Design a protein around this motif. Structure first.
Motif, PDB file in Angstrom:
ATOM      1  N   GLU A  19       0.828  -1.198   0.000  1.00 10.55           N
ATOM      2  CA  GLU A  19       0.000   0.000   0.000  1.00 10.55           C
ATOM      3  C   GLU A  19       0.865   1.251   0.000  1.00 10.55           C
ATOM      4  O   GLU A  19       1.662   1.475   0.917  1.00 10.55           O
ATOM      5  N   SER A  20       0.722   2.042  -1.061  1.00 14.55           N
ATOM      6  CA  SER A  20       1.429   3.296  -1.284  1.00 14.55           C
ATOM      7  C   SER A  20       2.928   3.058  -1.369  1.00 14.55           C
ATOM      8  O   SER A  20       3.664   3.907  -1.879  1.00 14.55           O
TER       9      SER A  20
ATOM     10  N   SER B 131       5.176   3.673   0.170  1.00 13.23           N
ATOM     11  CA  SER B 131       6.064   4.804   0.415  1.00 13.23           C
ATOM     12  C   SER B 131       6.768   4.675   1.752  1.00 13.23           C
ATOM     13  O   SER B 131       8.002   4.672   1.818  1.00 13.23           O
TER      14      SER B 131
END
Lengths: 87, 247, 27, 162
Positions: free
Chosen positions: B184-185, B187
């Motif tokens: 998820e993301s 990041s």
RNA sequence: CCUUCUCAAACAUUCUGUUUGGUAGUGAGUGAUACUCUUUGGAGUUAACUUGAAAUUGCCUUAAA
């Protein structure tokens, strides 16, 4: 698939397996980006690497002649590029 | 000392950057707006070079996919210009030889052509990711002590879980799915990791070492291309073995 | 402990998270 | 001791930069090594053994050969060391080229010349006809030795040194 | 002690064809002919000439130490 004993403790993994008389105890760590002591010398251990490594080399050569086998074994690329393990 | 030659040298080098990226931004002008009246081509590409040298062309047309980033020096003559230096500054890749993952979407894609002639780039593989994190990565951490302007090697699962308690994550191999399959993301996984400092492929200033230094100057000066056209399509390589060596 | 015996220990001491034999060194 | 005008014209040599440039040039022209000739002549050996020759280039370094290029005259620039074991050998070159209008240039060391040639020493190494690539770098180079060395150094012809 | 935008789509299947795109210079000076312009503001454009890449004052640090 000839092994006897397994020990584990705070330091890594001690596997123990026997060959025809002389019997083997050895170690594998728990993998981390954990740094080098940045003191102790490799050189002594680098030449332990040269000789002991060669030992390992022929021992596995004459050791694939146990039945009959191609020394050293071929590997498939996808194995390592993906897995990179004993698989 | 200045070595007056060097002066002009840097200058012309710097210019080839500017006029390059400036053109690029104007391409980034007419691929932003689809304002094209007369241009070269509106479609970008990626130039895929693999190894005697077997090449080909494609287009990214994302479809988010992670580019793998390994920074190495170049082109040795240049003062960083503004926009390059910043677009890197996000990726903090100055103090060079800093490897990092970057997920590439089409808002990631066109910003590349500034970074093209700096890092060498390519889609990684599994064992490159797991193997590249397993030997490296560092965490800036505070607790129980440590006002800490200091970096911590990766061992302690207490910090693993603990700082990843947000996402319900233990065991940074979870981040593997977060990365390999791009979770998820993605990041905070990599921002977390405080990405990587490679060891240079071959050390330097020695006798036999100096040889290898030259051979690297050879192959590195060939396989690292550019157009400098502002239409320059990105260069992609197979970094797996590269990281068999570098890490 | 699967090979500390050769037994294939049933799942009762197991099937997480119940307690497992704590270490049981070979020696 | 006081040294004759025909000497002490050595000891006046080319600077860090101009020398550096000269070797920026010649280091293109290294006369091919021995294993080189063995290379090309082995490959062609197998070729014409089973299965169009532009004029080769190098610097022309034989001392006898070099003075031979001059007095024809052939050469373009000549590099002359400052140290010859029998210092005698070269004493007449800087005059010679002078009277013949040849761009002679004193470059420091006989190991330094000797290394560009695949030898231990030269004390003289020079070239005449060059590829067109650097022809401009040549015309300017000789213009630079004219301008640096030649111009203000007429003085060296008189004036016992020491 | 620097190293140069060496390709695109589109169309039609023909050992190639069709079509639209994509290119800002070392400077200095010779110059007789025009176009065009706009209120003197002379602006962009018009044959083709000389030249040693020539000259004078057009408001990131391992390419270290």
């Amino acid at each position: 698939r000839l092994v006897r004993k397994v020990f584990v403790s705070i330091k890594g993994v001690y596997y123990q397996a026997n060959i025809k008389g002389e019997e083997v105890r050895w170690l594998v760590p728990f993998k981390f980006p954990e740094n080098i002591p940045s003191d102790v010398d490799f050189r002594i251990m680098l030449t332990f690497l040269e000789f002991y490594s060669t030992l390992l080399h022929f021992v596995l050569y004459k050791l694939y002649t146990d039945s009959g086998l191609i020394y050293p074994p071929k590997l498939d690329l996808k194995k390592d590029k993906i897995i990179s393990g004993l698989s | 000392f200045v070595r007056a030659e060097s002066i002009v040298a840097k200058t012309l080098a710097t210019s080839r950057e500017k006029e390059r990226i400036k053109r690029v931004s104007i391409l980034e002008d007419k691929k932003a707006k689809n304002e094209t009246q007369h241009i070269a081509s509106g479609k970008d590409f990626i130039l895929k070079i693999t190894e005697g040298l077997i090449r080909e062309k494609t287009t990214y047309d994302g479809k988010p996919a992670l580019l793998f980033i390994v920074r190495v020096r170049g082109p040795l003559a240049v003062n960083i210009p503004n926009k390059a230096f910043k677009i890197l500054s996000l990726l903090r890749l100055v103090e060079t030889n800093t490897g990092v993952f970057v997920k590439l979407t089409k808002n990631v894609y066109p910003l590349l052509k500034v970074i093209a002639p700096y890092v060498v780039i390519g889609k990684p593989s599994l064992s490159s990711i797991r193997s590249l994190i397993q030997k490296r990565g560092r965490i800036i951490y505070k607790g129980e002590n440590e006002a800490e302007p200091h970096e911590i090697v990766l061992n302690d699962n207490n910090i693993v879980e603990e700082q990843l308690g947000d996402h319900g994550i233990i065991c940074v191999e979870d981040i593997i799915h977060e990365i390999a399959t791009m979770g998820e993301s993605f990041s905070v996984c990599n921002f977390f990791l405080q990405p990587f400092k490679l060891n240079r492929e071959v050390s330097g200033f020695g006798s036999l070492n100096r040889l290898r230094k030259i051979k690297q100057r050879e192959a590195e000066s060939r396989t690292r291309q550019f157009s400098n056209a502002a239409t320059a399509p990105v260069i992609e390589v197979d970094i797996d073995s590269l990281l068999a060596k570098l890490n | 402990d699967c090979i500390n015996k050769g037994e294939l220990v049933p799942a009762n001491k197991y099937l997480p998270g119940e307690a497992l034999p704590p270490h049981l060194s070979p020696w | 001791l006081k040294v004759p005008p025909t000497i002490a014209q050595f000891q006046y040599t080319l600077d860090r930069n101009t020398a550096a440039e000269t070797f920026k040039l010649f280091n293109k022209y290294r006369p091919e090594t021995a294993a080189e000739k063995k290379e090309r002549l082995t490959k062609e050996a197998a070729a014409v053994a089973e299965g169009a020759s532009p004029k080769p280039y190098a610097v022309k370094y034989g001392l006898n050969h070099v003075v031979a290029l001059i007095e024809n005259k052939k050469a373009k620039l000549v590099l002359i060391a400052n140290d010859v074991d029998p210092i005698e050998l070269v004493v007449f070159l800087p005059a010679l080229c002078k009277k013949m209008g040849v761009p002679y240039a004193i470059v420091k060391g006989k190991a330094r010349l000797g290394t560009l040639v695949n030898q231990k020493t030269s004390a003289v190494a020079a070239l005449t006809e060059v590829r067109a690539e650097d022809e401009a770098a040549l015309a300017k180079l000789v213009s630079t030795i004219d301008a640096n060395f030649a111009d203000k150094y007429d003085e060296v012809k008189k004036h016992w040194g020491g």
